[PDB]
Design a binder for this molecule. Structure first.
Ligand SMILES: O=C(O)CCc1cccc(-c2cnc3[nH]ccc3c2)c1
Length: 193
């Protein structure tokens, strides 16, 4: 396995997300949502909340275990390695094709955050920003797709709604929600079994 930096994704985005049109834009959403879904499939977290923010960014929040908060080699946070090294893998690809991205992790009574800008360059380390109840766990990822890469940066409520509905049906017993702050639209899906 040859590891690569995020420049490899930015120079050949179609290789990783298929295209740079609306289909490619939404593949970014699928990658972030699918990580939360995978956690829930393993029994960690029973709701996944997606928000299309007023500024055009998108947030996915889950209540899974929380991504690793520890260190890799050289005092580099494990989360930074996940978001900045291409193991060519979804997280790093989204970061590469975003003008900014924030990851917030809650676990063990602490809330941590790291911010990346301009195609995934870290502008902070993983820093403790606050506290929470010891029971509270989860990951929140917010990203702004890079307008210099995509021909459209407009997330489509109906497209995302449909995908989240399908994911809720396949998962069972997990609530998926979508809120659009541009229009105030909102919906929730949950299938009991
Ligand atoms: O605490 C441990 O030992 C396991 C940690 C642990 C191990 C593997 C995966 C996760 C994890 C969790 N939430 C996530 N949300 C999106 C991706 C993602 C990954 C957390």
């Amino acid at each position: 396995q040859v590891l690569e930096g995020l420049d490899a994704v930015r120079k050949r985005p179609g290789m990783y997300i298929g295209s740079t049109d609306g289909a490619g834009l939404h593949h970014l959403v699928w990658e972030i949502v699918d990580n939360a879904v995978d956690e829930a499939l393993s029994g960690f977290g029973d709701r996944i909340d997606v928000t299309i923010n007023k500024d055009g960014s998108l947030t996915v929040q889950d209540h899974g275990r929380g991504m690793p908060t520890g260190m890799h080699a050289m005092g580099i946070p494990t989360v930074e390695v996940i978001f900045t090294i291409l193991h060519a893998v979804g997280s790093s690809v989204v970061n590469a094709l975003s003008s900014w991205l924030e990851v917030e992790i809650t676990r063990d009574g602490a809330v941590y955050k790291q911010r990346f800008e301009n195609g995934g360059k870290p502008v902070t380390t993983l820093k403790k920003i606050g506290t929470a109840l010891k029971s509270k766990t989860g990951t929140k990822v917010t990203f702004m797709p890079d307008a210099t890469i995509f021909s459209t940066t407009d997330f489509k409520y109906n497209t995302i709604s449909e995908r989240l509905n399908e994911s809720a049906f396949l998962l069972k017993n997990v609530t998926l929600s979508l809120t659009d702050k541009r229009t105030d639209e909102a919906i929730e899906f949950h299938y009991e079994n």
